[PDB]
């Protein structure tokens, strides 16, 4: 939900600048056991609220691994390294899912964010993300999440 990233004044908030038209993104997640998730999303602003449409395709998860067996325990703190490329804003993450067995399950993720109109692109910087499941029913057909996200310069020193 990229409209809600806190930005410093001197870094252009690409996602907020894209509105009201909005932006689209496409994400690929490669998990260490061969599992793949590809996701596309369209974000727009209508009737004063943001409207998100998402499609997700996950394939090749070992029928015996932590995802299919519901053995994960949440995402660690995430640092998404942002950079402009080919007219779009890209984000790359190396990030783990906690496992019930005292362990970790790693993912490499790359996302391309493109505004529907011309928007100024930022240079390289990081987005720091905390993503929490705050509550759920027994079978996760109802789930509540909290996220905090903040851009930080990755160059530029103490300045």
């Amino acid at each position: 939900s990229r409209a809600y990233v806190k930005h410093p004044a001197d870094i252009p908030d690409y996602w907020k600048l894209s509105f009201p038209e909005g932006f689209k993104w496409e994400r690929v997640m490669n998990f260490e056991d061969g599992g793949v998730v590809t996701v596309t999303q369209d974000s727009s602003l209508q009737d004063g609220e943001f409207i998100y449409k998402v499609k997700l395709r996950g394939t090749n998860f070992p029928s015996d691994g932590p995802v299919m067996q519901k053995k994960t325990m949440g995402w660690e703190a995430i640092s998404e390294r942002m950079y402009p490329e080919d007219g779009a804003l890209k984000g790359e993450i190396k990030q783990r899912l906690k496992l019930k067995d005292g362990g970790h399950y790693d993912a490499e993720v790359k996302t391309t964010y493109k505004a529907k109109k011309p928007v100024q692109l930022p240079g390289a910087y990081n987005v720091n993300i905390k993503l929490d499941i705050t509550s759920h029913n027994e079978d996760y057909t109802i789930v509540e999440q909290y996220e905090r996200a903040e851009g930080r310069h990755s160059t530029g020193g103490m300045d």
Partner: protein
């Protein structure tokens, strides 16, 4: 733009997807403070539930 994006904003999300062939749909709604960088969501599986896989692969797509 600092006009059209208020200090408090709500959102609606629709997901359609499949994992290892298992089709499902999810409808949700959230809210937060765009300039402060914080938000909450409540999601409900509407088709394909209960899900045979970790919710954690879906959470970053919402968020």
């Amino acid at each position: 733009n600092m006009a059209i994006i208020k200090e408090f904003m709500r959102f609606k999300v629709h997901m359609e997807g499949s994992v290892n062939g298992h089709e499902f749909e999810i409808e949700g709604e959230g809210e937060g403070r765009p300039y402060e960088g914080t938000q909450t969501a409540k999601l409900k599986v509407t088709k394909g539930g209960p899900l045979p896989f970790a919710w954690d692969i879906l959470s970053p797509q919402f968020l």
